[PDB]
């Protein structure tokens, strides 16, 4: 209940959708690299363990 392969490639191959899809891909991937930078910051900022 949607576009066929034929109907999709006739619309979603437009340069506006190609640039949008590139933007979403890089937005996600920089977002994941940001979330890892966030975790690496917390792991440095956290109080280190008492020695034994």
């Amino acid at each position: 209940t949607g576009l066929s392969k034929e109907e999709l490639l006739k619309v979603a191959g437009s340069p506006g959708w190609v640039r949008t899809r590139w933007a979403l891909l890089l937005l996600f991937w920089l977002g994941w690299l940001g979330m890892l930078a966030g975790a690496v910051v917390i792991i440095v900022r956290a109080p280190r363990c008492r020695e034994l």
């Binding site: 209940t1 999709l8 979603a12 991937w29 994941w32 975790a39 917390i42 792991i43 363990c49 008492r50």
Partner: protein
């Protein structure tokens, strides 16, 4: 456009041993001993859960080679119990089972991977949530780019965790070479030992979600099951043997992380290897569950229970992108849970009730429709033994926990509103249909996905 078959026997064994071996043998060895009281009963429930898993898994090899649809337990339930029972089954797995179990093994990945930066204090909770999320996101992205990536990742980490379990068993053998049963025996309590043990075997049914993606299912599905679960059972009883050679009962009952104490004792300056391998053991299971979970929802959308976009495929890569992006996002919502490990009781109740219904169905369908082909057939005793066993486990644990099980049934019954609205009663103003269509084609345009064919 439809998904290519490319799971070999070896990649199917890697799916099962990779997805089962998981976290349970590192995070739950204390869990059985706290209910079983002594090593002689604790090391026995580890074998008993192995047996119940083996006979249930062989039973799934009969049922799977019979019906041969993907979507596993859900598909096999639809062919016997029909539309509403199968939808409630899938609605429980959509809302709670496959999200929560993925977030559970992701939190264990984060915790044990970070543990050598914080030995002998709690690991920072917010970093343990982020690294749980980073794992799920990266394995969703890998699983979207290529099944020949995700299966090689499964092979890689299925190997890694068996090497780690080999070290643990070997150090056990070294120790007993170098050189008893005070037990709280109660049928109302030993059941929670079993429910703790079985969580560590959960996953024998997972290869049944990819039968339409293996290269030769009538050989490789029943072979991958019976190669895999004896290996798992052996590794688990020998691993527990190792822990009980190294530690006292009072240590294992009071320590937060049994494999870390085992590492500390045997390896000293080199002890960080055991935490990291418990990490890598969980990581492999997040992959195996994202793999098999996405295929379940894809089937549930194909056979009309779940909104249409989830059935679609990205045609250049042949990966079920909308289903993976959904099961991923649905897993990250469990980050808003405090005592998430509580959900292992709900997981244990809901899972073996669904397997019970499936195996009741296995007998019922073999009597009701005997003309359907049986490329492997094993026995009529193993189904009966598994049904009376699992119904015992359900009835007795329910009897001991009515307050918890009662609210549990409201999760089940929450499906009927959604079922009637979406599947059957079908409230249908033409603006709603125009909106659902518009939303679906918008999602197609973003992800570049086309519906499944022939």
């Amino acid at each position: 456009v439809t998904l290519q078959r490319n799971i070999t026997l070896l990649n199917g064994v890697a799916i099962i041993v990779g997805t089962i071996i998981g976290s349970g043998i590192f995070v739950t060895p204390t869990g059985v001993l706290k209910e079983a009281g002594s090593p002689g009963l604790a090391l026995v429930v580890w074998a008993a859960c192995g047996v119940f898993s083996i006979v249930g898994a062989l039973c799934y090899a009969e049922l799977g080679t019979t019906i041969s649809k993907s979507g596993g337990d859900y598909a096999y339930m639809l062919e016997v119990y029909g539309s509403l029972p199968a939808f409630l089954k899938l609605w429980i797995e959509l809302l709670i089972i496959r999200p929560s179990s993925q977030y559970i093994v992701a939190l264990v990945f984060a915790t044990y991977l970070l543990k050598p930066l914080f030995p002998t204090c709690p690991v920072p909770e917010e970093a343990a949530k982020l690294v749980a999320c980073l794992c799920v996101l990266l394995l969703t992205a890998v699983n979207c780019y290529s099944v020949k990536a995700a299966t090689r990742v499964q092979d890689a980490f299925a190997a890694a965790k068996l090497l780690a379990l080999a070290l643990i068993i070997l150090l056990g053998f070294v120790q007993i070479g170098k050189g008893f049963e005070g037990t709280k025996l109660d049928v109302g309590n030993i059941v929670l030992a079993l429910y703790s043990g079985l969580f560590a075997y959960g996953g024998w049914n997972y290869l049944n979600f990819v039968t339409e993606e293996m290269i030769n299912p009538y050989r490789n599905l029943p072979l991958a099951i019976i190669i895999s679960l004896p290996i798992v059972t052996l590794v688990y009883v020998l691993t527990n043997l190792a822990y009980f050679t190294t530690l006292s009962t009072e240590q294992m009952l009071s320590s937060e992380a049994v494999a870390v104490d085992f590492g500390n004792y045997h390896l000293g300056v080199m002890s960080w290897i055991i935490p990291v391998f418990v990490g890598l053991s969980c990581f492999g299971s997040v992959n195996g569950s994202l793999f098999t979970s996405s295929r379940l929802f894809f089937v549930g959308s194909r056979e009309g229970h779940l909104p249409s976009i989830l059935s679609m495929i990205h045609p250049q890569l042949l990966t079920p992108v909308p289903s993976l992006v959904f099961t991923c996002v649905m897993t990250l919502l469990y980050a808003f849970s405090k005592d998430i490990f509580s959900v292992i009781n709900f997981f244990s109740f809901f899972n073996w009730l669904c397997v019970a219904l499936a195996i009741i169905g296995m007998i019922w369908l073999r009597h009701r429709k005997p003309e359907l082909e049986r490329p492997i057939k094993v026995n009529l005793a193993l189904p009966v033994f598994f049904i009376l066993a699992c119904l015992f486990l359900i009835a007795v644990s329910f009897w001991k926990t009515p307050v918890e099980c009662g609210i549990g049934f409201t999760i089940i019954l929450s499906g009927l509103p959604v079922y009637f609205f979406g599947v059957w009663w079908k409230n249908k103003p033409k603006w709603l249909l125009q909106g659902i269509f518009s939303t679906t084609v918008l999602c197609q345009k973003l992800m570049q996905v086309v519906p499944q064919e022939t």
